[PDB]
């Protein structure tokens, strides 16, 4: 749950709506390093925070939210509503 992005990042490198935008923004720009860049980029952070809002809303009490935020690249789960 906290390594979903890492598997995709590794697999894509080996074989080289808002959530889709968030993936492209990080891929163009590119775990602590991933969390560092997002927390240090204003435009990227807005996309990442939006991505967690869509994925959590699209998917409720079963998923580990804290691990879900780590998948996107944030230190802690943001104060998203639902």
């Amino acid at each position: 749950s906290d390594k979903r992005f890492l598997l995709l990042f590794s697999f894509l490198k080996r074989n080289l709506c808002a959530s889709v935008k968030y993936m492209a923004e990080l891929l163009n720009y590119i775990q602590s390093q991933l969390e560092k860049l997002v927390s240090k980029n204003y435009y990227l952070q807005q996309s990442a925070k939006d991505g967690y809002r869509s994925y959590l809303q699209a998917y409720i009490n079963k998923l580990d939210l804290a691990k879900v935020a780590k998948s996107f690249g944030f230190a802690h789960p943001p104060n998203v509503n639902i």
Binding site: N41, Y42, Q45, K49, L65, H76, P77, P78, N79, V80
Partner: protein
């Protein structure tokens, strides 16, 4: 004088308390130092500092 009872803080709250986004103030170089800098340059040009 009963022992302290923590009926709320026994758990750790993962989300931040506030929901508002981060204004771009905290990512761009300070605007307030810019007023100070441009006022500082002006005195230098006009011969005050």
């Amino acid at each position: 004088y009963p022992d302290y009872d923590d009926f709320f803080t026994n758990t750790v709250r993962e989300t931040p308390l506030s929901s508002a986004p981060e204004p771009k103030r905290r990512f761009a170089p300070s605007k307030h130092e810019q007023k100070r800098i441009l006022q500082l340059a002006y005195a230098i040009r006009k011969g005050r500092i």
